[PDB]
Amino acid sequence: EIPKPVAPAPDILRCAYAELVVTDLAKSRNFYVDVLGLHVSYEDENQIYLRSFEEFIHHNLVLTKGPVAALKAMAFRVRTPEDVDKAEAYYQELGCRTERRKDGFVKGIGDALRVEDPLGFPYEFFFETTHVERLHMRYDLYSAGELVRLDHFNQVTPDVPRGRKYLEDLGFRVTEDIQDDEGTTYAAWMHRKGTVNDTALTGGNGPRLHHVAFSTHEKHNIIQICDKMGALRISDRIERGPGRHGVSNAFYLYILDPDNHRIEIYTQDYYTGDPDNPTITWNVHDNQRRDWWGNPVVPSWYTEASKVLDLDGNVQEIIERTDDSELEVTIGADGFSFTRAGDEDGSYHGQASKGFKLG
Amino acid sequence: EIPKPVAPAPDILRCAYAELVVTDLAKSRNFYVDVLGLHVSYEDENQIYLRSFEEFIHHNLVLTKGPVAALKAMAFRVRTPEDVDKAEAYYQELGCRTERRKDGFVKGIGDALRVEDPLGFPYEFFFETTHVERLHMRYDLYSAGELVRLDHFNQVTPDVPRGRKYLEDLGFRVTEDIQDDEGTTYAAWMHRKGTVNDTALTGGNGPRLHHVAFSTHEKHNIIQICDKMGALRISDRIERGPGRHGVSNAFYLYILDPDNHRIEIYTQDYYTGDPDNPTITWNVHDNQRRDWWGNPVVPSWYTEASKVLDLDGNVQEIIERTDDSELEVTIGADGFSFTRAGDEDGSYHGQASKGFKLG
Amino acid sequence: EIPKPVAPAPDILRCAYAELVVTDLAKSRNFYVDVLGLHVSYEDENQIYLRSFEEFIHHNLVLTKGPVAALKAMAFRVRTPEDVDKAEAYYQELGCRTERRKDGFVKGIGDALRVEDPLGFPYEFFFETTHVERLHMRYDLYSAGELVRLDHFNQVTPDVPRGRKYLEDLGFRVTEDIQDDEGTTYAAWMHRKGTVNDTALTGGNGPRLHHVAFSTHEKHNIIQICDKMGALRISDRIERGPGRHGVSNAFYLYILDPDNHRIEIYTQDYYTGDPDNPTITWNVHDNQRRDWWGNPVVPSWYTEASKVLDLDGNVQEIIERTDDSELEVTIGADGFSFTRAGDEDGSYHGQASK
Amino acid sequence: EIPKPVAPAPDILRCAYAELVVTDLAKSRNFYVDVLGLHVSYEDENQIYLRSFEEFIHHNLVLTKGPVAALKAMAFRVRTPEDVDKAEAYYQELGCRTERRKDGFVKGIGDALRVEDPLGFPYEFFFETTHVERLHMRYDLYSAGELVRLDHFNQVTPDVPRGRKYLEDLGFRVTEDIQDDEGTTYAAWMHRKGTVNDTALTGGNGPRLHHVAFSTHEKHNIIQICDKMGALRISDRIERGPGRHGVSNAFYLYILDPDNHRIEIYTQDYYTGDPDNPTITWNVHDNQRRDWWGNPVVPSWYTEASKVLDLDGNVQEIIERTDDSELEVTIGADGFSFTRAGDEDGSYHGQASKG
Numbered sequence A, B: 001e002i003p004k005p006v007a008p009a010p011d012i013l014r015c016a017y018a019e020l021v022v023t024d025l026a027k028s029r030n031f032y033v034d035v036l037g038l039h040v041s042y043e044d045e046n047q048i049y050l051r052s053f054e055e056f057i058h059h060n061l062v063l064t065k066g067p068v069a070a071l072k073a074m075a076f077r078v079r080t081p082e083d084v085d086k087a088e089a090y091y092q093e094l095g096c097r098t099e100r101r102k103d104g105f106v107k108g109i110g111d112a113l114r115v116e117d118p119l120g121f122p123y124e125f126f127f128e129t130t131h132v133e134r135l136h137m138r139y140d141l142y143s144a145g146e147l148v149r150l151d152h153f154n155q156v157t158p159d160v161p162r163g164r165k166y167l168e169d170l171g172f173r174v175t176e177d178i179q180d181d182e183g184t185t186y187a188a189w190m191h192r193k194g195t196v197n198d199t200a201l202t203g204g205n206g207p208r209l210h211h212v213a214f215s216t217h218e219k220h221n222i223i224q225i226c227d228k229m230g231a232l233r234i235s236d237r238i239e240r241g242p243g244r245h246g247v248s249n250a251f252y253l254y255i256l257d258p259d260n261h262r263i264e265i266y267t268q269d270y271y272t273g274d275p276d277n278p279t280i281t282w283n284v285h286d287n288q289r290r291d292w293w294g295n296p297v298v299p300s301w302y303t304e305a306s307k308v309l310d311l312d313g314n315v316q317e318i319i320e321r322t323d324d325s326e327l328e329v330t331i332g333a334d335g336f337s338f339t340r341a342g343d344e345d346g347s348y349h350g351q352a353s354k355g356f357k358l359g
Numbered sequence C: 001e002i003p004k005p006v007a008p009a010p011d012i013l014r015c016a017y018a019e020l021v022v023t024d025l026a027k028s029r030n031f032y033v034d035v036l037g038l039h040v041s042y043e044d045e046n047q048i049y050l051r052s053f054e055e056f057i058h059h060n061l062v063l064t065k066g067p068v069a070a071l072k073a074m075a076f077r078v079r080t081p082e083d084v085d086k087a088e089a090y091y092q093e094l095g096c097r098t099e100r101r102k103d104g105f106v107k108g109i110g111d112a113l114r115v116e117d118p119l120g121f122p123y124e125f126f127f128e129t130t131h132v133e134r135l136h137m138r139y140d141l142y143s144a145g146e147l148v149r150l151d152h153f154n155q156v157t158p159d160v161p162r163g164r165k166y167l168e169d170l171g172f173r174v175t176e177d178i179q180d181d182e183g184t185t186y187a188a189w190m191h192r193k194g195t196v197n198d199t200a201l202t203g204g205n206g207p208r209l210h211h212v213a214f215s216t217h218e219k220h221n222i223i224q225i226c227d228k229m230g231a232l233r234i235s236d237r238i239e240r241g242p243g244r245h246g247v248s249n250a251f252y253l254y255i256l257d258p259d260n261h262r263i264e265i266y267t268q269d270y271y272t273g274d275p276d277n278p279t280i281t282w283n284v285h286d287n288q289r290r291d292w293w294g295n296p297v298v299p300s301w302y303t304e305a306s307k308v309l310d311l312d313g314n315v316q317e318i319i320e321r322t323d324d325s326e327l328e329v330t331i332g333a334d335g336f337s338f339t340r341a342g343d344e345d346g347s348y349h350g351q352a353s354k
Numbered sequence D: 001e002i003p004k005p006v007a008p009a010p011d012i013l014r015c016a017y018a019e020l021v022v023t024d025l026a027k028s029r030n031f032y033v034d035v036l037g038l039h040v041s042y043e044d045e046n047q048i049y050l051r052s053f054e055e056f057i058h059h060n061l062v063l064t065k066g067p068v069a070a071l072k073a074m075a076f077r078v079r080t081p082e083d084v085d086k087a088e089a090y091y092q093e094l095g096c097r098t099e100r101r102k103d104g105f106v107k108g109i110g111d112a113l114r115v116e117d118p119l120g121f122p123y124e125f126f127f128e129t130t131h132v133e134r135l136h137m138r139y140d141l142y143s144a145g146e147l148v149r150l151d152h153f154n155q156v157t158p159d160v161p162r163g164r165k166y167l168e169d170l171g172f173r174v175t176e177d178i179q180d181d182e183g184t185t186y187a188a189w190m191h192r193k194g195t196v197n198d199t200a201l202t203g204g205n206g207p208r209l210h211h212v213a214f215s216t217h218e219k220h221n222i223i224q225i226c227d228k229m230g231a232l233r234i235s236d237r238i239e240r241g242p243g244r245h246g247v248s249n250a251f252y253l254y255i256l257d258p259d260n261h262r263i264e265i266y267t268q269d270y271y272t273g274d275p276d277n278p279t280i281t282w283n284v285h286d287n288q289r290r291d292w293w294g295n296p297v298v299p300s301w302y303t304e305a306s307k308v309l310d311l312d313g314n315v316q317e318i319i320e321r322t323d324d325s326e327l328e329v330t331i332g333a334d335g336f337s338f339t340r341a342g343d344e345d346g347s348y349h350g351q352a353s354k355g
């Protein structure tokens, strides 16, 4: 159990950026800039700094060339410079390794703290960042698939309640989760900025990074990304979707970058900023919980995720989940799901929905 | 081979309506009216007559109570009253059974000819029909999922080239097809009204009716149908999609009515009215041909289809396809598909795309 | 200037609901329910309580039958029950008239404070509210024009800087404003919940309520409201739009209810939650500031607005703006606007655009 | 009245392309290619050949550098090569001037007939055309404002009934029109391809070209064109809209190219292909007939339109309309319009709607 510090939690505003290590900078650039249309704030032979259409901070995504593709940092912006000091004291009380750089780890960020958190994830906290031209009315640049914001991260961790408790102490509030009747938790979503999530926990072997999510304005923008990937003959990099989520109610798509980092495209979740925002718990066997239309969840969604680094740049050792597997209990040979609770019509046993089993 | 008659073909305008036999009229009404929003032109204890938002003829769909669910007629409107006489002479020359009713088979249709066509399908040709209020600007009635037109039919038949030649002689032009490199045709689409299709042939045991298709204005309307089916907890009646087609380039969805009659919702195909419109042939192993995003085609899409009736109302006997099966050659045991021609990366051997196999 | 209380400001979450007095309850019901598709949370012969598709608090709009159409209260939800006590102490220190009802003024709200604020507006602060079924996935009920959230209020007041400073003291942060080179402020927008606004000030004679805004998911939903109004042959109740705003970047529409209360439909403004969110100032003569496409702003949009009531239910007296008029300086006889600053081509003099 | 030929009318498929004379080819290129995103089929120092996203024929728009901006030809494609013969005989019987070129007037068109028609318009009829890559699934190229098809032309002509009869004999069917209670016709729309129009007649001084219209897939595509024009700070080239039409029920926008040639962007009209398609007639004083939302029609929309050329490349003389003016009777000093027929409330006297 991760203790609650006496030291006050930093006031976290929102997810702000991720630094992903990539193996081939030019191929990664082709994906994030030419395919997805993100906007370059800075680049050189070592790194590409990218932002979304409506962002004013320096970036939402740093692509860093390195030997092993991995998450290097998931960064949250805090409310004041003083909250970076609060972050440092807080994680020091937790007994985590921390590293503080007054002039930042990446360009366009100032005073920053990186930590190996209690779940093995490299978190960054910062306030100071270089402002850039906010492109929100640059309709001369707007693409048919425009990514307009960074919305959230999603983390794979073996023990969801243990991680949830720690994130609650840090000020994140649970919006939705997935459980079964025998009391196992499979996933939880939690926020600071008044949307369904800023980070989320997916049960699985970890620490691994499940995905980073960007939003679009409208559903047709997500459709266009799919259409464009078809035209580029890279439909094999469309992992899952598009669909409507149960959890979050957002329209969604999952795609894979050249190093298999998973990117979610997302729109039209709901407001969660009231403190008594009603929590929603889904049964793991409800076949509308992940895709509201009942479409099957592709097995790689449950099995594959990115390595994460420690503060030395080495890959974090993975710890196996011992709680039940969502894949197994829903779409594996022993699994089951339902459309209507208690109704055998529209229920699936030992296979996925829509007539498929696991390949 | 079906000979070309000496008698002139009737001048066919478009697909106009289908008559489906249903087993429980109230259950079927709930699907087509309460779920899908079609507009009631007339109903009684035996039939429901339904039209789309932009239609001015009496109906696009007749639901007729009967003991065995089946297609009873697919009806095409012809250009003049005299074209019904032409139809009669044409099909008589083909040696087909025909039935002529000066005052119609169904309400709101006048002088009509029904025929057991050379592929065993019940076709109707008519000109005369009762005009009704055209609801195309009745935005006070417009549904978030509104079906705006009848678009096409799709027929399952064992020998696609045989049927294709007959429909070409009747004046339908093939817009797209699916073939392999060994002389097999798996499917063809053909039109009169200047869209991708008015009827289509899908290879398989037949005669059976694969689907009837209605159009929407925009892609979000199709999304809404899915969303509504989730809210009604009938997502199990979403068979396949939503997607982007390769063939037709339309955005699409397939759903199943209470008797398992398949309905396609469709939007934003392209203009085909020029007489040298380029015919697009897809290779059967191209994994973007049916779903442009490479999502797998659900096996029921290839195996399941509705019975069709003869003019006496008895079910037509099924003739087995002996040509190769699209299912088997793409997703079955010895199947193959590709993302990029000649690339092993993104190819699938003996399974479907996206991590699935046949149940 | 309105002094800052020593008493701590209540922690305001967001705009939550408006109580509008209407003269014919059935006619108003037809507009808000049958035309606009809002969801009934309670109704009787005197009041209709309505909410948007994604709401979980009891209501976003209360229609109350009364003799004179007016705004009766514009209500903000606060973070905790103790914030209602804070609001009471705060407005008492401002010297404002206050009324506290521990069981609420309207159904589905608990302990609530109403105040005649320093600008003459009836504000309510509350925490307690009856939760209802959140309809956000009830796509069986979803309209082609569905209104999904309450987004903001917009207030007409004569001195925008005076009101702005007062709202900033209450914790609202300015996101955008309209000024000229002479130093006049014509309008400001300000927020708590991390969108472009929860309330906004339009320079003019006040206190009057300019509009209440609801959001949709997508731009086609706004189109559909216009299309429906054409089908119902009430297109004369479309006042302005649909358009793209300059300020806020939102897609918008303004329509008029049966008592001439103005309702905005709005979608797709941007995130403002960071405390150093860059503030945008437009020049009043920029013809893309209000409608990005340069469509003219109809004079009624500048001149017409709803009465507001005091705590006794009487109409608040109005104070005339003495600062320059946006209408006069842009589309009046001596006004002007530009498409490109410094270019006579695409400029309009003594005249609106187009 | 224009007589009906004994000679059979050509089978016309659809509107196919327009040739527009422009004064500065580079400025026009910037508008049609960089702003609007049309696809270049061919270009040189004198001409740009452009097509829409879903087209397979060579082009939908030819921009031809010349000294006077004008319509040079509005072209319709016919069903067979023999229909170009039929067209030639038909217009010859009408007593119209004709010119036929076996190798075309512009690149990518083969055997083609141009005529000075009975209303003074330069029509082309052709079958043969060079097929190009259909870009309908090139979503790697797709713009947020993508123009997907050529939809129609709209012609300004002084006597609408006279022109209507002639187009009906030529095989166009009237889908919608605007009349009043005193026997005046102000406008008519007419088709071959099964949409609301392929060409249309707008009452006014003519011959002039009112506009050329291109389709989008969705309404948001039209909104994006407006948004982009705002970002480019050329919102003054937005003339009217966006809106919903009464006539046609399409979502629409009107913009102005660098020589003031008017382009409509259009989507989601309805199917008209049945021969008994119900004709819809609006009253000229109905304020929802042109913009369904009641937004006012700016006077320039009524007064301004492009010159057209004869077969020698000279500007056609303009004949004045003597029938009542739609502008005057609706928004002029003595004009009138209504929201609800018979209701004084929401009516407008001697001014336009919405203030």
Ligand SMILES: O=S(=O)(O)c1ccc(O)c(O)c1
Binding pocket: C154, C200, C213, C245, C246, C247, C248, C250, C264, C289, C290, C291
């Ligand atoms: O017309 S404005 O662009 O000034 C504008 C922007 C945001 C609003 O909410 C508003 O009502 C007005």
Ligand SMILES: [Ca+2]
Binding pocket: B180, B181, B182
């Ligand atoms: Ca082969």
Ligand SMILES: [Cl-]
Binding pocket: A245, A289, A290, A291
């Ligand atoms: Cl999910």
Ligand SMILES: [Cl-]
Binding pocket: B245, B247, B289, B290, B291
């Ligand atoms: Cl398909």
Ligand SMILES: [Cl-]
Binding pocket: D245, D247, D289, D290, D291
């Ligand atoms: Cl119009």
Ligand SMILES: [Fe+2]
Binding pocket: A152, A153, A154, A200, A211, A213, A264
């Ligand atoms: Fe996610």
Ligand SMILES: [Fe+2]
Binding pocket: B152, B153, B154, B200, B211, B213, B264
């Ligand atoms: Fe189909």
Ligand SMILES: [Fe+2]
Binding pocket: C152, C154, C211, C213, C264
């Ligand atoms: Fe507003």
Ligand SMILES: [Fe+2]
Binding pocket: D152, D153, D154, D211, D213, D264
């Ligand atoms: Fe037009």
